[PDB]
Amino acid sequence: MDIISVALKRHSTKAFDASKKLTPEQAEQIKTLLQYSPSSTNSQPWHFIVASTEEGKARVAKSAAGNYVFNERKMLDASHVVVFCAKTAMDDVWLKLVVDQEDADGRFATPEAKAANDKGRKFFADMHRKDLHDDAEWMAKQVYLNVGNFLLGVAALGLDAVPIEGFDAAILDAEFGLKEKGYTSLVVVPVGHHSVEDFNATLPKSRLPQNITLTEV
Amino acid sequence: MDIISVALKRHSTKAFDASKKLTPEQAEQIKTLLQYSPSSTNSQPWHFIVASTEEGKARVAKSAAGNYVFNERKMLDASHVVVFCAKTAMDDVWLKLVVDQEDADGRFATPEAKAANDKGRKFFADMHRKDLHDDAEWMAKQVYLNVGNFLLGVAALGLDAVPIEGFDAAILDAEFGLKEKGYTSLVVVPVGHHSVEDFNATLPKSRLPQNITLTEV
Ligand SMILES: Cc1cc2nc3c(=O)[nH]c(=O)nc-3n(C[C@H](O)[C@H](O)[C@H](O)COP(=O)(O)O)c2cc1C
Ligand SMILES: Cc1cc2nc3c(=O)[nH]c(=O)nc-3n(C[C@H](O)[C@H](O)[C@H](O)COP(=O)(O)O)c2cc1C
């Protein structure tokens, strides 16, 4: 159970074995990972859809019918398929909700601590929706962080997965009633076990040398 | 069971033990982690700065001014500090860097297949920097994905870390001459070991209930 090995061994599955499914335990482990991911000020500006039924994966895959047909198969054949969603705008409600939760779990000693945490959360939230007018992308950024967390996490569970950015968010939004609830699709991640039609399992892993992307000071 | 415990036990350390440094192997491991993270089309539109010296860390801490004082401590007290940077504009010279390392690592069986990815990568990049004119946030989204992978990874190594968004991007960029190289800092991640002053090490992890963030279908 060494994380580097799993980091060097994991890959983007290009073909899933429709027959091999997720344990009801692994199915639970998948939702736990999504939920427990960190976020700026613990804003958790996301929403997830975890397709488990063929009727569900088809609903999702329905967004890959365009010029992303090669992606369609990964969706339908994989055990579970999660489509990460980000909030469209950071509202005062979601903010009150987060702090009310942190309080419910006992993260505040005095009511003054609770207030100081809320003012700090609103400081950052405001500099985004009021100063820089980027709360939508700031929120989308955290969702991606959640994905990086997820990809490594499932890989460490001995599961295969692949981050799909090639899909019509517009079609997916409409198909699930998103945007109405204040959300958008950003990444689709089919999870399960790979089949022999997956070429990327035999191919070596590649990244640019550290002498180009990294500076030590 | 394995990464899940890691995921639920990890926390945003608020105070570091300066004397507690990373072991020689741990230092190489965090670097590997930064390197093998996935990214859309394997574009790796990122750059990292790892400060391990006392001089390096102070230079990064320079960005912890104004209303970001509460983060200066962690940037100096932590064993190593990683500055996550994204490219400011995706140019063909880099798309050529990626494809050349993929060809060199032995992923392409036929020269037709290499030209097949170059086109795939280009088409994806083209619709971002031309049509939507948002390649700056697209590359930035990839960096956050890398951070998520990093946060869980260092935690799996038994290391402490806190993702910092509270710093001055201009000071960090200027202090390192990033704009001229084509980069901008997004997230700062000091990593080492927590001190007993870390009030967050003993506090309970708070997250929203799954009945709000997750829709199982
Ligand atoms: C992108 C990002 C930026 C953050 N910025 C800061 C920061 O500037 N300073 C800090 O002390 N914590 C920062 N946090 C830590 C969050 O408050 C923390 O991740 C969140 O409350 C969840 O707590 P946990 O990491 O203990 O699970 C940041 C987290 C993320 C993901
Ligand atoms: C955000 C994102 C989007 C990607 N889009 C796709 C996609 O639509 N289809 C696909 O097969 N792979 C996709 N990839 C997988 C990448 O090509 C892959 O992560 C990269 O080549 C590095 O290889 P690895 O995943 O084996 O480490 C994507 C990856 C990420 C992180």
Give me Rg for the CA atoms of chain A: 19
Distance from CA of A80 to the nearest CA of B (A): 10
Tokens of A165: 């950015």
Greatest distance between any 2 Cα atoms in chain B: 59
Expressed in angstroms, the distance from the first to the final Cα of chain B is 25
Spatial contact of B164 and B187, defined as CB atoms under 8 Å apart? yes
Is-contact A201 A13, C-beta < 8 A?
Answer: yes
Ligand 2 pocket, mutate which of A63, A165, A167 (most atoms under 8 A from CB):
A165
Q: Which of B165, B194, B205 to mutate to test the pocket of ligand 1 (most atoms within 8 A of CB)?
A: B165
- Name the closest residue on chain B to residue A84, using Cα atoms: B214
Cα A30 versus chain centre, distance: 11
Determine contact, residues A59/A173, Cβ cutoff 8 Å.
no
Which helix (H) or strand (E) segment holds residue B186: the answer is: strand B183-192
**Does A74 count as an annotated binding residue?**
yes
Tell me the two tokens of residue A17. Answer: 């074995």
Establish whether residue B164 lines the binding site of ligand 1, counting it when its CB lies within 6 angstroms of any ligand atom.
yes
Nearest CA in chain B to A205: B105
Is B48 within 8 Å of B37 (Cβ atoms)? no
> Do the Cβ atoms of A149 and B144 come within 8 Å?
no
CA–CA separation, B55 and B57 (whole Å): 6
- Residues composing chain B: 217
Angle ∠(A8,A12,A15) on CA atoms, nearest 5: 135
Residue A81 to residue A54: CA distance in whole angstroms: 10
Q: Would you list which residues of B are annotated within the binding site?
A: 10-14, 41, 71, 74, 107, 165-166, 205-207
Catalogue the E-assigned strands of chain A: 46-51, 80-87, 160-161, 183-192, 214-216
Which resolution in angstroms does this entry have? 2.5
Distance CA A42, CA A146 (A): 12
Kindly determine whether residue A56 and residue B97, on different chains, have CB atoms separated by under 8 Å.
Answer: no
Contacts of B105 in chain A (CB under 8 A): 204-206
Total Cβ atoms within 10 A of residue A26? 18
Of A195, A174, A144, A197, which is closest to residue A60 (Cα–Cα)?
A: A174
Tokens representing A130?
Answer: 């009021």
| Interatomic CA distance for residues A12 and A103, integer angstroms | 39
Ligand 2 atom with minimal separation from the A200 CA:
26
Domains in chain B with CATH codes: 1-217 (3.40.109.10)
